[PDB]
């Protein structure tokens, strides 16, 4: 029974290696990675791979791995798929920990924009969780942490992390991670998956997929939101993506809204993540 080697980049930046039968469905690998991570609240997470166009794709757990990675390497990342709007509701501290690791990468990468003060506050909770109480012996006036906190580090930011870290004496790791999450969950781009698109007129927009619905950034700023309950049908055709809106009160007809995606694969990918968010957040 022939087995394929799988390499998974974990959220701590380390590499998990395992073997699965070459006809294995994604769920098989996901279950192995989640057992490795001692993760029981698996519903929020998934594996990504890179397609032939180097685009991130979710590995569908119901479909054969070989029919998704196709001609590419069996290389994956473990990632948060559904960002919970209220992480305090999660049953396990270890789930909140993995969510913290994902968000730290969201921040350093620039996917999750953050004010100076929030970068320093989030940083100070990470430092408290991982090193415990502030110690002056490790940190002089010229201290720079090994921890990556921001897309661009400044001495000012390092100083503010330390100033807030001092305020957190006695804080336990789960407590610091919960504080991290109470701040992160409020950021305007928390759990927003962004997709480049054009509107029905050809103007460049971003579509954001998240718990609260489909967001349109017709400018650099948000300009429209469609709450999932208002969406009856998500569809794609060629390079186009469509949402069927419920009729407003006393309106005779549903309304259909159309967007142009970079290519057919990008339209299909956007359709699938919207359907998945719609289902997940309808049930949560
Ligand atoms: C709409 O709800 C969904 C939709 C999709 C998933 C999913 O693919 N998770 C990752 C995995 N490998 O199991 C989980 C729940």
Which residue puts its alpha carbon closest to atom 2 of ligand 1? Answer: 280
Instruction: Calculate the alpha carbon distances from 169 to 92, 137, 218, 230 in Å.
Output: 23, 15, 44, 46
Name every residue whose Cβ is closer than 8 Å to that of residue 209 and which is 6 or more positions away in sequence. 192, 193, 195, 215, 270, 273, 274, 277
- Burial class for 122, CB neighbours closer than 10 Å (0-12, 13-18, 19+): buried
186 to 7, 141, 168: CA distances (angstroms): 33, 32, 21
What is the CB < 6 Å shell around ligand 1?
26-27, 30, 43, 46-47, 58-59, 61, 81, 276, 279-280
Distances (CA, A) of 272 to 57, 71, 84, 252, 269: 10, 21, 19, 29, 5
Give yes or no for a contact between 199 and 191, defined as CB atoms under 8 angstroms apart: no
Contact predicate 90/21, CB 8 Å: no
- Looking at ligand 1, which atom is closest to the CA of residue 58? 8
Say which residues have a Cβ less than 8 Å from residue 113's Cβ, sequence separation at least 6: 187, 188, 189
Cα angle for residues 129, 172, 186 (degrees, 5° grid): 65
Distance CA 35, CA 20 (A): 14
Q: What is the spatial distance between Cα 164 and Cα 273, in angstroms, rounded to a whole number?
A: 37
* Residues in Cβ contact with 266 at an 8 Å cutoff, skipping those fewer than 6 apart: 55, 195, 196, 239
Q: Which of 39, 68, 81, 272 to mutate to test the pocket of ligand 1 (most atoms within 8 A of CB)?
A: 81
Q: Name the burial class of residue 210, with classes exposed (0-12), middle (13-18) and buried (19+) by CB atoms within 10 angstroms of its CB.
A: buried
The widest CA-to-CA distance across the chain, in whole angstroms, is 71
In whole angstroms, what is the distance from residue 246 CA to residue 154 CA? 48
Given a contact cutoff of 8 angstroms between Cβ atoms, the answer to whether 157 and 149 are in contact is yes
Nearest to 51 by CA among 41, 39, 42, 60: 60
In this structure, are residues 259 and 241 in contact, taking their beta carbons and an 8 Å threshold? yes
Backbone angles phi, psi at 16, to 5 degrees: -95, 130
Distances 105 to 61, 114, 130 between C-alpha atoms, Å: 24, 13, 16
Sheet of 204-210: strand order equals: 224-226, 213-217, 204-210, 193-199, 255-260, 240-245, 231-237
Measuring from atom 15 of ligand 1, which residue has the nearest CA? 43
Angle at 93 between CA 89 and CA 96, to 5 degrees: 70
C-alpha 89 chain-centroid distance: 18
Mutate to test the pocket of ligand 1, among 31, 78, 82, 83 (most ligand atoms within 8 A of CB): 82
282/284 Cα distance (integer angstroms): 6
DSSP the chain: --EEEEEEE-TTS-EEEEEEETT-BHHHHHHHHHHHHT---GGGEEEEEE-TT--EEEPPTTSBSHHHHTTS-SEEEEEESS--S-GGG-S-HHHHHHHHHHHHHHHHHTSS---HHHHHHHHHHHHHHHH-S--TTT--TT---SS--SSS--HHHHHHHHHHHHHTTT--HHHHHHHHHHHHTTSTTTT-EEEEEEETT--EEEEEEETTEEEEESSSS--EEE-GGGEEEEEEETTEEEEEEPPPTT-SS-EEEEEE-SSHHHHHHHHHHHHHHHHHHHH-
Atom of ligand 1 at shortest distance to CA of 47?
12
What tokens appear for 174 in the block? 């789960």
Which residue, judged by its Cα, is nearest atom 7 of ligand 1? 46
């Amino acid at each position: 029974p022939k087995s394929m080697q799988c390499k998974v980049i974990l959220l701590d930046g380390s590499e998990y290696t395992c073997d699965v039968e070459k006809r294995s469905r994604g769920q098989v690998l996901f279950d192995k990675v989640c057992e490795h991570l001692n993760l029981l609240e698996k519903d929020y997470f998934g594996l990504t791979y890179r397609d032939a166009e180097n685009q991130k794709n979710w590995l569908d757990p119901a479909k054969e791995i070989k029919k998704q990675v196709r001609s590419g390497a069996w290389h994956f990342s473990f990632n948060v798929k559904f960002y919970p709007p209220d992480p305090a509701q999660l049953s396990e501290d270890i789930t909140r920990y993995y969510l913290c690791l994902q968000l730290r990468d969201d921040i350093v990468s620039g996917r999750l924009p953050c004010s100076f003060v929030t970068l320093a506050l989030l940083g100070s909770y990470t430092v408290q969780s991982e090193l415990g109480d502030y110690d002056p012996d490790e940190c002089g006036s010229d201290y720079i942490s090994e921890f990556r906190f921001a897309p661009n580090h400044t001495k000012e930011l390092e100083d503010k992390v330390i100033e807030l870290h001092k305020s957190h004496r006695g804080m336990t790791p789960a407590e610091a991670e919960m504080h991290f999450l109470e701040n992160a969950k409020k950021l305007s781009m928390y759990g927003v998956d962004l997709h480049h698109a054009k509107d029905s007129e050809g103007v460049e927009i971003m579509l954001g997929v998240c718990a609260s619905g489909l967001l349109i950034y017709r400018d650099r700023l948000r300009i429209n939101r469609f709450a999932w309950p208002k969406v009856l049908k998500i569809s794609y055709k060629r390079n186009n993506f469509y949402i069927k809106i419920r009729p407003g009160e006393f309106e005779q007809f549903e309304s259909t809204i159309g967007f142009k995606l970079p290519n057919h694969r990008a339209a299909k990918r956007l359709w699938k993540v919207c359907v998945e968010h719609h289902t997940f957040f309808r049930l949560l």
